[PDB]
């Protein structure tokens, strides 16, 4: 599971393992091609090149080399001349699967002429036009697939949530930029005395729509377009459980300080704040992979950035909530309860 | 290889890290940091945000590229040595050379379907992009080094005069070859586009006496005529040809040498399965995205190619290539 645990270095200490880091593009890109034309549907049973070759409209050579390519990393098993689907691949590749992946291949192969103008985005004080704030509204196969991708990614995590002992005797629940939604409907299917609140953007509407038909919560759940950035749109909220999860690393440190705030104000007393983030420490670089997070959150919208987990843990105090935690392999469970007298 | 989901979307995924460090090669960003900058002092120099040169520092903390010491970063020693564009051992024609192919190989489908060259093809973008064209030279010069080393204390050449180097390109093969057999003389023979690489290597190593270029294209049976040499070498290269025109050009080759002389052939191991050894079959696609009839042919079709010219074939496996030696009968 991708959201298990990361080593606190990852230095290169080699020239070897430089050239390798700058080559390793190539093997996405193949990946990205195999999933794009679905060739794995085709390999579900085997086939020759010759075949592979009439099926795609391929030169019968160069199908033949790709298949190789495929077939020595692990995705393809050549038998004879034919070649067939791998375990993992048929899991995971084809489009028939219930465990398909193809929603996250997408999501990272459409981001794939952004990060080379990584120069543009650390000289721009304002979103650059393929951002997500500016994509969304017109790239319905990106915001979809991102939003797909991310129900997927986050299912470790849900499962953790949900059990928390915080929902046992809460009656209500609000989840802002609750988005797709996966933690607030699987929270509310196993605790049946509760009722919900997502509060996002009209991008998120329609995901959150049928997250909640998809589990029978209709009765249960309302949707609210809200801006969390505006102190106005918490006037009156009030939840025994209030979620921030997986979302402050889009603020800017003034601006998720501001969201924390509001966020906590709608907690009631004896109540929780839960929010949900990358772990990382205050020296910015440990664990490394943190530091990735990071960059690729900045590299997705303009003030994209993983805040450290311990400032993060300090506003909510500044709050007034007492903190408690909860690791969830590479992410850190913040639980900020307000006491009752 | 790949044997999780894990594996596949970090698969999927590991294209980033390559794009960090070619735009931290592109920018000289390690030219600056040659003396330890805060984000703030960075972001002045590049006209950056603060904010967001702090991230990216961050990020190349975290990869070992740059050290955190207080509030400045420097260069690590790796670093320091590879990506500083004054070090003698800077990377940066291996680095650029790979960030020019990047819009090339989300274009997979479009060369499986293509019979013939296509724009960003070496074979079409070096005639029109001088700078793709040198990228690619020098970053094959330093990428050659390990195997030149071998070819060059290779004992065919302690009784030989003469030799050709075929497709030679850059020349670095040949040139330690002479270096280290002051008795040799050499001729290089390859395409209008190589002729500024070789050149650069005959007078790096004031070669110029000894070593000759001849424009020639391999596939025309012609230019081989008159040519004959103790030693005739053809060094990592017949990856650019169909296996039909890979027996042509070995033919050819193999015509080249003088009784009592060698052809070398220095080729990627690939067993005859194709998919063996694994890093092999990533070759071959490589090439194929590089050239139109970029392909990596089975070690033992080439050996066989080779003994039906008439030539006793000696085989040793170094790293990931084998060198084919075709010893070919004296009195002919």
């Known amino acids: ?19 390798k880091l700058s080559d390793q593009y190539r093997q996405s890109a193949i990946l990205h091609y195999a999933v794009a034309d679905k060739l794995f549907d085709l390999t579900q049973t085997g086939r020759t090149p010759a075949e592979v070759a009439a099926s795609f409209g391929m030169v019968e050579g160069k199908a033949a080399i790709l298949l190789h390519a495929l077939a020595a990393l692990g995705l393809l098993t050549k038998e004879g001349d034919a070649f067939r689907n791998t375990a993992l691949t048929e899991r995971y590749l084809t489009t028939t699967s219930a465990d398909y992946i193809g929603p996250i291949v997408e999501h990272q192969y459409l981001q794939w002429d952004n990060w080379p103008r990584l120069g543009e985005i650390l000289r721009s004080e304002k979103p650059l036009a393929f951002q997500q704030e500016s994509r969304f509204a017109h790239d319905t196969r990106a915001r979809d697939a991102f939003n797909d991708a991310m129900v997927r990614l986050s299912q470790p995590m849900v499962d953790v949530v949900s059990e928390l002992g915080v929902f046992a005797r809460a009656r209500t629940v609000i989840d802002l930029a609750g988005g797709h939604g996966t933690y607030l409907a699987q929270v509310l299917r196993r605790h049946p005395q509760l009722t919900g609140q997502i509060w996002d953007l009209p991008t998120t509407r329609d995901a959150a729509r049928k997250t909640i038909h998809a589990h029978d919560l209709g009765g249960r759940v309302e949707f609210f377009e809200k801006n969390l950035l505006d102190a106005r749109n918490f006037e009156g909220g009030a939840a025994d459980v209030v979620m921030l999860n997986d979302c402050l690393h889009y603020f800017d440190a003034r601006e998720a300080r501001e969201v924390i705030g509001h966020a906590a104000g709608l907690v009631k007393p004896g109540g929780a704040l839960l929010i949900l983030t990358m772990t990382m420490n205050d020296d910015r670089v440990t664990p490394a992979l943190s530091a990735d997070f990071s960059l690729h959150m900045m590299v997705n919208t303009n003030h994209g950035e993983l805040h450290p987990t311990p400032w993060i843990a300090g506003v909510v105090r500044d709050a007034g909530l007492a903190v408690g935690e909860r690791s969830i392999g590479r992410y850190t469970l913040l639980i900020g309860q307000r006491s009752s007298g």
């Open 1 to 19: 599971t991708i959201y298990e645990s990361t080593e606190d270095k990852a230095a290169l200490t080699s020239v070897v393992d430089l050239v």
